[PDB]
Design a protein around this ligand. Structure first.
Ligand SMILES: O=C(/C=C/c1ccc(O)cc1)CC/C=C/c1ccc(O)cc1
Lengths: 167, 171
């Protein structure tokens, strides 16, 4: 077994000190992820693996997460994203868009419907949760939800990230 | 747990552009197989477990040279792309005083641009986004992106997390 390097889920731009952060699937709140049927934890292997859940079949899809503003850079414009993948053999997404919300400390909420049949198959997509400018304190929360009658299948959650606008 | 193999990439949702991540095991690390130069570690985030990344830590060598490459034709045409190296520095750190890490992007036309990063000023342990350069996605051939320091001094304490090739999309 290899020696270890420990990390934290933030990063900093060398050139100016701007911060971003991300959270991995065990740091998210996924309803019924341990029910043994709706989600199956996989080893996500690129090119060792990371623990990532794949949706195997349920009508109840509910993914939530949260972040602290204090860890971000005040005044800086951010994009909030969920890295996720529609896999081959997906089902249920024709009739059921995912409902996506980003909640900011100022009480606002950005809402959108996401039609997953337009995502490419078997590659990760940066699903847009929303956009905001960071302040000094407060909680950021997001949700990706559908509980409709369609049995949804074939969806991997990789991580959630708050990144300064790419430049 | 069942294994899931995936391309180490992403697509922007609204606009379609493709970004690339390259883990260090897929880069060309000169002296990468010599433990007295680079010792390979498992990357841990406590609240999640292992992140599934093997990362090299510089252990005491004068020759720092790491290369990545990617076919420009595999990226999204007409976009401007930005190459990043994600790195970390850790105690013990040694040798870097006045020998900044060189980041280079070389194009198919042989043209190249180099930035410099003073590792001595970085906060230890923090994951650092460094900018290696930019390029427009046109033509084909391979873009080469490197970190280099070959000054005559033993260096230690640099950790390479991954390289990133990311589009700058409209929003
Ligand atoms: O444009 C960016 C994309 C971030 C990103 C985060 C998680 C992914 O799944 C895919 C991409 C932000 C700047 C780079 C952040 C980053 C953090 C850790 C890392 O290992 C590589 C890049």
């Amino acid at each position: 077994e290899l020696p270890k390097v420990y990390t934290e889920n933030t990063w900093m731009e060398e050139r100016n000190g701007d911060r971003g952060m991300l959270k991995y699937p065990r740091e998210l709140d996924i309803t019924n992820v341990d029910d043994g049927k709706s989600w199956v934890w996989h080893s996500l292997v690129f090119g060792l693996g990371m623990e990532a859940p794949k949706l195997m079949g349920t009508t109840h899809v509910e993914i939530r997460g949260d972040f602290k503003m204090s860890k971000l850079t005040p005044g800086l414009k951010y994009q909030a994203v969920l890295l996720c993948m529609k896999t081959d053999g997906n089902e249920g997404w024709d009739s059921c868009p995912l409902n996506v919300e980003l909640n900011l400390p100022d009480g606002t909420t950005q809402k959108r419907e996401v039609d997953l049949t337009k995502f490419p198959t078997d590659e990760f997509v940066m699903m847009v949760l929303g956009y905001f400018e960071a302040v000094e304190s407060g909680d950021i929360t997001f949700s990706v939800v559908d509980t409709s009658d369609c049995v949804k299948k074939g969806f991997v959650v990789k991580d959630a990230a708050l990144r300064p606008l790419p430049r | 747990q069942p294994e899931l193999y995936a391309e180490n990439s992403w697509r922007e949702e609204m606009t379609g552009e493709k970004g690339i991540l390259i883990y260090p095991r897929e880069l060309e690390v000169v002296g990468g197989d010599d433990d007295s130069c680079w010792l390979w570690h498992s990357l841990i985030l406590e609240s999640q477990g292992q992140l599934g990344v093997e990362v090299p830590k510089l252990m005491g060598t004068k020759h720092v040279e790491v290369h990545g490459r990617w076919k420009i034709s595999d990226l999204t045409p007409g976009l401007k792309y930005q190459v990043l190296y994600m790195i970390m520095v850790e105690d013990p750190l040694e040798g870097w005083e006045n020998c900044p890490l060189k980041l280079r992007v070389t194009l198919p036309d042989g043209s190249s641009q180099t930035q410099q990063v003073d590792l001595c000023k970085l906060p230890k342990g923090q994951l650092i986004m460094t900018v290696a350069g930019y390029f427009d996605c046109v033509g084909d051939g391979e873009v080469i992106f490197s970190v280099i320091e070959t000054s005559d001094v033993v260096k230690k304490g640099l950790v390479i997390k991954d390289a990133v090739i990311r589009p700058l999309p409209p929003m």
